[PDB]
Amino acid sequence: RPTFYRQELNKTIWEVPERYQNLSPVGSGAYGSVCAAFDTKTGHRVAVKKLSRPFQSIIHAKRTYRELRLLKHMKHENVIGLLDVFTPARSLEEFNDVYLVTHLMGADLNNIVKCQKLTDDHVQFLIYQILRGLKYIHSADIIHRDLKPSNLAVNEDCELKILDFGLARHVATRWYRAPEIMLNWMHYNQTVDIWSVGCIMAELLTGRTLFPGTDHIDQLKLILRLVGTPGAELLKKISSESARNYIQSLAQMPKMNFANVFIGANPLAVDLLEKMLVLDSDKRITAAQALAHAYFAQYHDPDDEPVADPYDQSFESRDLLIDEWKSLTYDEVISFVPPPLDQEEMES
Numbered sequence: 001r002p003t004f005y006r007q008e009l010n011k012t013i014w015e016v017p018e019r020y021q022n023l024s025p026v027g028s029g030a031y032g033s034v035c036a037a038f039d040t041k042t043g044h045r046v047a048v049k050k051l052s053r054p055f056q057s058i059i060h061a062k063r064t065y066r067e068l069r070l071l072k073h074m075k076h077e078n079v080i081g082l083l084d085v086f087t088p089a090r091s092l093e094e095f096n097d098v099y100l101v102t103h104l105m106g107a108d109l110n111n112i113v114k115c116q117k118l119t120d121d122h123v124q125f126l127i128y129q130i131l132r133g134l135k136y137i138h139s140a141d142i143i144h145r146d147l148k149p150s151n152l153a154v155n156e157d158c159e160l161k162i163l164d165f166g167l168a169r170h171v172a173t174r175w176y177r178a179p180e181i182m183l184n185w186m187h188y189n190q191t192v193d194i195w196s197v198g199c200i201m202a203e204l205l206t207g208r209t210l211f212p213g214t215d216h217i218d219q220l221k222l223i224l225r226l227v228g229t230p231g232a233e234l235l236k237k238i239s240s241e242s243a244r245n246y247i248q249s250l251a252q253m254p255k256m257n258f259a260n261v262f263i264g265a266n267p268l269a270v271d272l273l274e275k276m277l278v279l280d281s282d283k284r285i286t287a288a289q290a291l292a293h294a295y296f297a298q299y300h301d302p303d304d305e306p307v308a309d310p311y312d313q314s315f316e317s318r319d320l321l322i323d324e325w326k327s328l329t330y331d332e333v334i335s336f337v338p339p340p341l342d343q344e345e346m347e348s
């Protein structure tokens with residue numbers, strides 16, 4: 001067991017192994033509090049995330065366990081991978097905090113979009129990497145649920161990683177969210193993530209948020225203006241008569257021609273955007289289909305787009321006591337094994 005030390009940053013107490021020095025805040029959010037640090041054992045900068053009140057309620061306890069299970073499973077070049085997991089607790093009875101460590105990226109995608117106007121080639125490589133990491137996530141029967149520029153970060157080579165997963169089941173921008181999430185549809189497709197990819201791609205191409213809604217209804221207002229009011233084939237799938245009547249009451253909006261909306265973009269990029277930003281989720285392109293789209297011809301390698309090991313998420317169906325959730329999390333902390341050092345990291 002390493003020696004821990006305590007330190008206050010922007011009003012939150014941090015207790016970490018001595019290996020981690022130079023703690024500086026990165027951000028404070030609903031996910032948790034996040035610091036940058038220098039890992040004196042590896043010589044790399046890391047991001048450290050302290051779970052906020054992990055066992056305050058059944059919901060929070062399950063959500064803590066969910067996040068740790070998820071992150072322990074993720075081993076892919078374009079997905080956040082866990083370098084370390086620790087708690088200052090010496091015993092399960094003392095167990096009340098969880099810290100998660102990953103490599104510190106250079107910049108998130110809000111900062112790249114504000115820093116430069118990306119070339120088409122850059123947009124290809126960034127979106128390709130998101131879809132590559134997404135193929136992996138969907139292959140484990142996971143929906144990310146919260147792809148957005150601040151959950152996407154890159155290094156000096158524009159190598160990209162998908163970060164924090166959406167932990168809601170059954171503060172946080174709406175701008176990249178699939179309309180069916182906002183409307184309580186309840187049996188979501190993995191293609192909610194594909195909707196979010198399309199919103200991101202649009203923004204990378206234009207420099208501007210595609211759908212910057214002011215609130216929940218505005219968000220859907222802006223979506224329907226671009227993709228149109230729902231077609232007959234989609235209306236067939238909506239049980240509620242009152243819901244259909246309200247839609248039929250709207251000013252009927254046609255789908256806009258994306259070639260005109262994104263005028264100047266690579267026609268292949270526009271074609272791919274049309275296949276992502278479809279209202280009907282059954283008709284959105286999948287991550288694996290999108291990687292085979294001609295827009296990615298320069299980067300697509302069918303033999304280097306790996307899939308995930310099966311992911312046992314039978315826990316999602318459990319209703320357990322808070323003490324069991326806390327206990328199962330603690331077992332996961334204890335059993336964690338750090339990945340190996342890279343080959344490039346060692347010499348002769």
Ligand SMILES: CNC(=O)c1cc(-n2ncc3cc(Nc4c(F)cccc4Cl)c(COC)cc32)cs1
Binds near residue numbers: 026100104153
């Ligand atoms: C110079 N560098 C920069 O400015 C930036 C670096 C990053 N960056 N790099 C990695 C990383 C990981 C997380 N989350 C996290 C974590 F900290 C630890 C373990 C697990 C997880 Cl999911 C977050 C917070 O989520 C938004 C930001 C992160 C973002 S801007």
Ligand SMILES: CCCCCCCCO[C@@H]1O[C@H](CO)[C@@H](O)[C@H](O)[C@H]1O
Binds near residue numbers: 184
């Ligand atoms: C008031 C206008 C809102 C329109 C929202 C679309 C209605 C979505 O409603 C959904 O329809 C699904 C299929 O019938 C059901 O499975 C879901 O329970 C229901 O919420």
Ligand SMILES: CCCCCCCCO[C@@H]1O[C@H](CO)[C@@H](O)[C@H](O)[C@H]1O
Binds near residue numbers: 189247280282
């Ligand atoms: C009708 C109000 C505007 C929102 C349209 C969103 C339609 C999303 O598409 C729907 O996704 C559901 C899964 O969530 C599927 O069950 C439905 O089959 C599919 O049509």
